[PDB]
Amino acid sequence: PSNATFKNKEKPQEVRKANIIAARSVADAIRTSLGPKGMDKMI
């Protein structure tokens, strides 16, 4: 009765993991600039 499985490639997140980490660095940048209590940046 077990069956189920349906896995095949074992790293579906590998492509979508580091991209979120790269997006989190961008997301963490606006967290410090958000709201009137936020901070500014220099480019």
Query: Which residues contact another protein (rule: CB under 8 A)?
Result: 1-6, 29, 32-33, 39-43
What's the DSSP call for residue 29?
H
Cβ at position 24, least distance to another protein in Å: 14
Q: Which C-beta is closer to another protein: that of 23 or that of 39? A: 39
Cβ at position 25, least distance to another protein in Å: 10
b/e sequence 16-43, b meaning 16+ C-beta within 10 Å: eeeeeeeeeeeeeeeeeeeeeeeeeeee
Instruction: State the residue for tokens 């940046």.
Output: 41
Q: Which C-beta is closer to another protein: that of 3 or that of 8? A: 3
